Design a protein around this ligand. Structure first.
Ligand SMILES: Cc1cc2nc3c(=O)[nH]c(=O)nc-3n(C[C@H](O)[C@H](O)[C@H](O)COP(=O)(O)OP(=O)(O)OC[C@H]3O[C@@H](n4cnc5c(N)ncnc54)[C@H](O)[C@@H]3O)c2cc1C
Ligand SMILES: *N(O)c1cc(C(F)(F)F)cc2c(=O)nc(N3CCCCC3)sc12
Length: 427
């Protein structure tokens, strides 16, 4: 079931024609890899295509669409383990798991992502500072490697090196077929949330450094990257935790695990309204309200700067607002500890996502941003990238050589390849 198809990432740029295999038959997939391994443009897995860049395409090669492998094999409330095919998506998983009092332990800002894509990008969420990234919660996975064998990987077993190279490995160690995830127990589908509004970058940072982060499992902020200082870096901060049944109002206690401008705006009254609106304590909120509040020709850019380099982070934010490039939708968060995966994106520090309209000079400006991010100890996220250079990437990820070595062992013939692997010289 092969079709020549034109593939892009979610950004709809850097287009690339590939032979797309789409089949629910795992044995067909094993044979397609073993076939590619005989004859040399290789293969890469694809999930739901929500990564903005070029990690899920392979120009003139094979792309295996994993979404048809979407069986949930089992869910267990006592062990908190789910056993699922890699093509299962987090929305599907959230729905299926709620009736067991289980919560998907790491959720990104859209639930249309596959488990395979979640592992391969080692995705993070609003709870990174309390929960780590997705890879921290994988207890096993079955990896179809270049030799056509399916390998059972665990984080502390004898194949730990390959497991942790696969986490964050952008599909370049093989095809994740199936995994077991440890879910988070919950008594409800709701959050209890506190809101705070700051008037400056200095305050934003202050709020995230005063120790209050430890009282919240989930935390993120909308961020002003346009206004000149002092307003620059002012934020609507939303923080919280999963509610217990005891904390819900009467109306919702019976089904606790359910799911289902003007002239004033820019002046003093507007400022007061927004400040009041964004300030609250103990507000009960569902998933959409707390986690996806947005449900009511761009360049996506995300970077993190090590915690200690706070002055340097501020400098970068100033560079952005003074650039002449205007990003209105900005997400800020303080990441917590990193994990063992050599290519994992998150590190403890100041994370920000920005979104720039594509216009003259942007390309060259974002290259300079890369340079500053690199210089200040930070990195970019592959899930949001199609334009950075191999030299920059390699310097941002000093464990890349360590990772490349692992990849060479498991794929000596370069059976697995993508546009991204060639661009960033991970091939
Ligand atoms: C609106 C929006 C919000 C987002 N918010 C966040 C966020 O808050 N946090 C965050 O971390 N990310 C976020 N992302 C990025 C997204 O979580 C990742 O890009 C994710 O990897 C996409 O999953 P996918 O199934 O669509 O994978 P694809 O984009 O199809 O593939 C991405 C990578 O995963 C690999 N892959 C997919 N399936 C398999 C498999 N079975 N075996 C091996 N490799 C595989 C591919 O080869 C590729 O390298 C967001 C994206 C969007 C569009
Ligand atoms: N940046 O991609 C980013 C980061 C985080 C983080 F807090 F976990 F770090 C969350 C996050 C999100 O929830 N949603 C994002 N989307 C959807 C809403 C509009 C902008 C893109 S981005 C994001």
């Amino acid at each position: 079931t092969t079709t020549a198809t034109r593939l892009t990432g979610w950004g709809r740029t850097a287009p690339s024609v590939a032979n797309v295999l789409r089949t629910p038959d795992a044995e067909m997939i094993v044979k397609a890899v073993a076939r590619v391994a005989e004859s040399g443009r290789g293969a890469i897995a694809r999930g739901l295509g929500r990564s903005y860049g070029d990690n899920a395409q392979n120009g003139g090669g094979l792309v295996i669409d994993m979404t048809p492998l979407n069986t949930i094999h089992s869910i267990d409330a006592d062990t908190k383990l789910v056993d699922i095919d890699a093509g299962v998506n987090l929305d599907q998983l959230m729905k299926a798991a709620l009736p067991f009092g289980l919560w998907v332990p790491v959720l990104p800002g859209t639930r249309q992502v596959t488990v395979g894509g979640a592992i391969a990008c080692d995705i993070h969420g609003k709870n990174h500072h309390s929960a780590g990234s997705f890879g921290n919660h994988v207890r096993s996975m079955d990896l179809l490697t270049a030799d056509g064998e399916i390998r059972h990987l665990t984080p502390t077993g004898e194949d730990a090196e390959l497991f942790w190279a696969t986490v964050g490995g952008n599909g370049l160690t093989g095809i994740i077929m199936r995994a077991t995830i440890e879910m988070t127990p919950t008594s409800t589908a709701y959050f209890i949330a506190d809101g705070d509004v700051t008037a400056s970058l200095d305050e934003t940072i202050a709020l995230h450094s005063d120790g209050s982060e430890a009282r919240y499992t989930y935390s993120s902020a909308w961020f002003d990257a346009i206004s000149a200082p002092p307003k620059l870096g002012r934020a609507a901060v939303s923080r919280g935790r999963l509610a217990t049944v005891e904390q819900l109002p009467a109306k919702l206690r019976s089904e606790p695990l359910k799911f289902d401008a003007n002239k004033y705006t820019f002046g003093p009254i507007g400022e007061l309204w927004y400040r009041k609106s964004g300030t609250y304590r103990g507000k009960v909120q569902n998933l959409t309200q707390f986690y996806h509040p947005l449900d009511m020709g761009f360049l996506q850019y995300q970077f993190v700067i090590p915690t200690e380099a706070v002055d340097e982070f501020k400098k970068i934010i100033g560079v952005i607002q003074a650039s002449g490039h205007y990003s209105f939708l900005n997400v800020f968060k303080l990441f917590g500890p990193r994990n063992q995966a050599p290519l994992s994106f998150p590190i403890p520090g100041w994370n920000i996502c920005v979104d720039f309209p594509i216009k003259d000079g942007l390309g060259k400006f974002v290259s300079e941003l890369d340079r500053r991010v690199l210089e200040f100890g930070g990195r970019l996220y592959t899930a949001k990238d199609s334009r950075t250079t191999a030299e920059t990437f390699h310097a941002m990820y000093p464990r890349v050589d360590e990772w490349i070595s692992v990849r060479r062992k498991v794929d000596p013939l370069r059976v697995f390849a993508s546009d991204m692997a060639r661009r960033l010289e991970l091939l």
